[PDB]
Design a protein around this ligand. Sequence first.
Ligand code: K
Ligand code: K
Ligand code: K
Ligand code: K
Ligand code: K
Ligand code: K
Ligand code: MG
Ligand code: MG
Ligand code: MG
Ligand code: MG
Length: 80
Amino acid sequence: GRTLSTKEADIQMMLAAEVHLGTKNCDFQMERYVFKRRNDGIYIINLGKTWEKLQMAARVIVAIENPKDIIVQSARPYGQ
RNA sequence: GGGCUCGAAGACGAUCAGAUACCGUCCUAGUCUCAACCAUAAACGAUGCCGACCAGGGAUCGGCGGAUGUUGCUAGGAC
Ligand SMILES: [K+]
Ligand SMILES: [K+]
Ligand SMILES: [K+]
Ligand SMILES: [K+]
Ligand SMILES: [K+]
Ligand SMILES: [K+]
Ligand SMILES: [Mg+2]
Ligand SMILES: [Mg+2]
Ligand SMILES: [Mg+2]
Ligand SMILES: [Mg+2]
């Protein structure tokens, strides 16, 4: 048994989706979220910080009284 | 002292209205070196020297520290 917590399952899903795979370059202001660099050169993102930031963004979004005042847009085809 | 080459000056051949030029041909000084002078250049980064702070990134030269795997090589060298 040992049912996983919400954070556990969320991070498992993120790993399944490869959310933790960065690029070969790191922005100096994104370094605080990167865990370490692998021998290949791809930076590994700290999924705990990603989950915490997702929770923080949800906290910010929920406080908007009218959801119609929020606009979400994606330039790339994948995120549309 | 050297004097190959190129080549101020000079002399010719062209072009041109003229052509003391640009183009072509032959050449003196010079161009090289030694001894002694000269002390000037858009001698430019058109940007004094010393010292402190001040964003990010990838390359590159020299030295050094660490890790790691190869080398038709001799712990080292190359990566
Ligand atoms: K000569
Ligand atoms: K001459
Ligand atoms: K003329
Ligand atoms: K002089
Ligand atoms: K200059
Ligand atoms: K450097
Ligand atoms: Mg001659
Ligand atoms: Mg001389
Ligand atoms: Mg002067
Ligand atoms: Mg070096």
